[PDB]
Structures are given as C-alpha cells and as structure tokens.
C-alpha cells in the first residue's frame, strides 16, 4: 500500500552564456543529495558544476531537466556562477527535487 505525488515546476533557469580560453586553476565540488547520494572529485574552476550535473545526470540516466544544483542558497546550473561567487575549492552542490517526472 502506497501513494504518493507532486506539483509541476518546468523552466528551472538554464544559462549557457560564456566565452572559452583556458585558464588555470583547482576547484573541489560535492554534490550531495537530501537521500544520502553524494560524490566529490576536483576540476578546473572553469569548468566543475557543468561536468558535475552533466556527469550526475548523464550517470542516473536523467536528462538535466529535473534536479535543481543549488550552492549555500544559490540555485544556479553553471560553472560560471558558483565559480566566480565562490572562488573556493569547497564548492558545495545540493541537489534537490521540486517535480516528478520519470
């Protein structure tokens, strides 16, 4: 016996809107998850959030249409805003679910 469900809430808040040169430099991010799920590994600042929603998607077998990447309060999905706010190796990711869908 069981039953459960939810409320819609499409158009999270996408982005892709930056240049691409090179850079340098060493961020550590850990997306955690509100079941327990959670994974950390260190990349380049310019590119971490990007890899890590698109490797946590890619790996659940889920598109990146339903999992909200918010950081200390800033829901954003990009490697650009957490990064430039952030400027830390200790950059945080808490993956949350506000809609059902698969």
Do not use: H, W
Not at 8 to 26: D, F, H, I, R, V
Not at 52 to 57: G, H, N, P, R, S
Not at 85 to 102: R, S, Y
Request: charged share 30%.
């Amino acid at each position: 016996m069981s039953n459960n469900g939810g409320e819609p809430s499409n158009n999270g808040g996408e982005g892709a809107e930056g240049t691409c040169k090179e850079e340098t430099a060493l961020v550590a991010v850990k997306v955690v998850n509100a079941d327990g799920a959670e994974m950390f590994f260190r990349i380049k600042s310019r590119t971490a959030l990007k890899k890590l929603i698109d490797t946590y998607c890619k790996k659940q077998g889920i598109s990146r249409n339903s999992v909200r990447f918010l950081f200390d309060g800033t829901p954003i999905d990009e490697t650009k805003t957490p990064e430039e706010l952030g400027m830390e190796d200790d950059d945080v990711i808490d993956a949350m679910v506000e809609q059902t869908g698969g």
